[PDB]
Amino acid sequence: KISGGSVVEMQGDEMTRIIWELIKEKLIFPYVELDLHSYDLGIENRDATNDQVTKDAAEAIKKHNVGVKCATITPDEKRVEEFKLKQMWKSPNGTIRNILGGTVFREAIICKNIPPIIIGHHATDFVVPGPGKVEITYTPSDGTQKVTYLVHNFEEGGGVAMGMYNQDKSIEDFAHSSFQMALSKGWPLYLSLKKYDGRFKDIFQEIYDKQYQKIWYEHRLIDDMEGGFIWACSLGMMTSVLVCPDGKTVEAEAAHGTVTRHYRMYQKGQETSTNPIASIFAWTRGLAHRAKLDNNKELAFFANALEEVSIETIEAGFMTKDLAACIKGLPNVQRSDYLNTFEFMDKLGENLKIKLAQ
């Protein structure tokens, strides 16, 4: 077995929980020995501990640099009363991002036989009750100006208004996170309201021509946009990763939800077919990041190995039903066109056993 080392992991809810556990027992643990800081973000436990788990889990990732996360129920009223929760807790993902900062990137994992671009997403509002001047003013600390622009003069009636700002530091991190990400995967980096959308283009350049292999960075406007590039701005084939400012701390995740609908059938004892891909990839993305930070060769090969098998397995035909519908189209899918959740998992572990054997 391999020496994986420090890894913060968070168990989640419902159908993804069940899948998460399988991923571990059938793909991870049979191959890798990890220093595993486990946190249970399952809904009943978060409620029990007053979302405290979540806070510590977050401190843990800050502290160990690697985080993989299972999907977690976010509470609304139906849920507050379904689990008889003592509060409408906030989204765990909300909590974690706050504590960590940095920027999220989503990637569709591309299986050649189904019908890659990596996209990286990145105020005071009030009501005007009636006519009057609304003016957005700026006051240096050495008060040598007093730019104050008129936003609008209301005469019609009242209305609504707001003031959005953005700090340089925060723009820099974006570009940092962006450029770094763009190196790590060796893909062209692109980035897409005069002076605002503006100063962005600026700082990127200033940081490109100062800190950053046959690869380029550029600029565009939305519409102009083969594949295979980073870009600042099925579901079970989507993978979200939070890259922090420091470029050391990473937290990976499936970009879908807890798949309640599927889980509900599971509870009825009905066969399911849930796409483990997005979840598996979150693991590998973090495990390869574990590797990079440690210079662990064996593991670094393993994470890749696992990412490989998962495509090859779908490519050799064997796949889950959501994927079966992309090919066949929902209405005309035979059972014999896909595997259920457990059979799929069985097939991976099998192909993985074998791929790792050579």
Place this chain on the structure above:
Amino acid sequence: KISGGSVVEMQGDEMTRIIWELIKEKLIFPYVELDLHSYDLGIENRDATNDQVTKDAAEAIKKHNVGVKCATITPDEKRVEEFKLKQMWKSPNGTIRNILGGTVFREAIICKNPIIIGHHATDFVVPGPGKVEITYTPSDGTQKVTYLVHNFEEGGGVAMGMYNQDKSIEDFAHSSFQMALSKGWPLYLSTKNTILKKYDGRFKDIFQEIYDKQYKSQFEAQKIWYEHRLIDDMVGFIWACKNLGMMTSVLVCPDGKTVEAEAAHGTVTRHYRMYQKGQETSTNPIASIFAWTRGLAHRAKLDNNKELAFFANALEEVSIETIEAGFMTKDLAACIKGLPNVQRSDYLNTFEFMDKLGENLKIKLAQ
């Protein structure tokens, strides 16, 4: 020949100009008689008249309530060079939009081989540290109100105001409620109401206030409903967002009487250079055709015109079912068979297609 009545029409530019003329020659004029208020919004005539025609065309739609626009060139520094324009004129739609007001509505066109979507600035650079604020002095001498946007203590950055008048939202509301009745589809508004509690909280309210005092009766009188939702709970209906030869844009006014319709794409300059040069092309008319069929549809609703009303639907089918039957333009061919695998014998070119559409409208109509 069905009499249609008062119709404002605006001829446009380049490729779309050509298609427009065919659309009238082969599919409209042979079946419908119209009191036509034409205006030529070609770049030439617009220039030669100091964009007066555009302004006239506007005031005329305001008047007769039904405008159908052919796509028109908006000039940029480059276009000006080419045409020797005496100014870089503002977009027609921009000027048209302002005179009539209202909200635009795009509609993708479904062939088995529907969702309508309606959408709706003071930036400046913070050099270094200091304070960014926004004020509201009320015009009635009451106490001036100050909000902190943010204190920049390290570097600078950037900041910006945004605003909106009540009146504008109300208009946004009406147009959408009118739009929902017109279509027989239920309506949804999407906001960032949790984040912009005070801002979007205003849209949501106004939609509700207007829904209940004005439209709740009529919606149920059609077995449909309006509802609010947040942007992620969102992802046969009308969707109000607070923010190709198969795409139809429609300006709807709040009075719900006036309406104006046009193809969403542009003037298709590429095909047109290819056309000037004399090579065959395969431009998609459908979107343009559809401007006519909403325009007519609307007039037919306004004027209690059962015979014209039927014509419109009749045509709308024909276009759909000509594609749905394997007869199509390259862009749609390519949609099915993949750009690299499209062959000549998979599509028909601009003229040939119009013919088929022509031939079929006859048949459909003879029944």
